[PDB]
From Swiss-Prot:
The modification N6-crotonyllysine is found at K26. There is a cross-link at K3, K5 (Glycyl lysine isopeptide (Lys-Gly) (interchain with G-Cter in ubiquitin)). It is involved in the initiation of both imprinted and random X inactivation. Ubiquitinated H2A is enriched in inactive X chromosome chromatin. Ubiquitination of H2A functions downstream of methylation of 'Lys-27' of histone H3 (H3K27me). H2AK119Ub by RNF2/RING2 can also be induced by ultraviolet and may be involved in DNA repair. The modification N6-(2-hydroxyisobutyryl)lysine is found at K26. Core component of nucleosome. Nucleosomes wrap and compact DNA into chromatin, limiting DNA accessibility to the cellular machineries which require DNA as a template. Histones thereby play a central role in transcription regulation, DNA repair, DNA replication and chromosomal stability. DNA accessibility is regulated via a complex set of post-translational modifications of histones, also called histone code, and nucleosome remodeling. It is found in: Nucleus; Chromosome. It comes from the Eukaryota. This is Histone H2A type 2-A.
Length: 54
DNA sequence: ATCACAGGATGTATATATCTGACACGTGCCTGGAGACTAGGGAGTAATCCCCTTGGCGGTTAAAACGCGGGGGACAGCGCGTACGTGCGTTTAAGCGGTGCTAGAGCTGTCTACGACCAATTGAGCGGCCTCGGCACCGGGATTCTCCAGGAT
């Protein structure tokens, strides 16, 4: 049994990834969401967040 | 000097006849709509808890309302001159039609890596709690604005 590990850490991100994946698959955006979509998106939201805050 | 009218010139709308290709209708599929069936999760209902909206009171205070005087902008009127509009004649390449080539859209069939799904485990994040520190406000002083008088242009 591997230890549970936050994806944000894995991706080197501060924004949550599992949650983004979760949001993407529902809200009825699509029947299915690919593994790399949540990750790509989390990076984008984080990037923009940084620009405004900076 | 201005009004209107009549004539000409021009451009528009009108009826007419003919042409053609874009619609209206019919045929033959064929695959998506409709009927029939079960299974189970979402929506509906009521309980009820308590948070937050409503209404009311009294002070106190800044903010609105009102009035007056006077400068400054909005507006109308005038005249200059030039930058556009209109019409003519020459030049351009747009549009039409047809030809020929093949690059890439669109569809078929096969196979497999990917994600939905489900059950188990747990730690990342949310609610509630205390603590005190950055921000808002007070009062005083510094200096940085605007505006008028008087002396230049």
């Amino acid at each position: 049994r591997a230890k549970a590990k936050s994806r944000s850490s894995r991706a080197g991100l501060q924004f949550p990834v599992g949650r983004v994946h979760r949001l993407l698959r529902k809200g009825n955006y699509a029947e299915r969401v690919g593994a790399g979509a949540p990750v790509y998106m989390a990076a984008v939201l984080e990037y923009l967040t940084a620009e405004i805050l900076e």
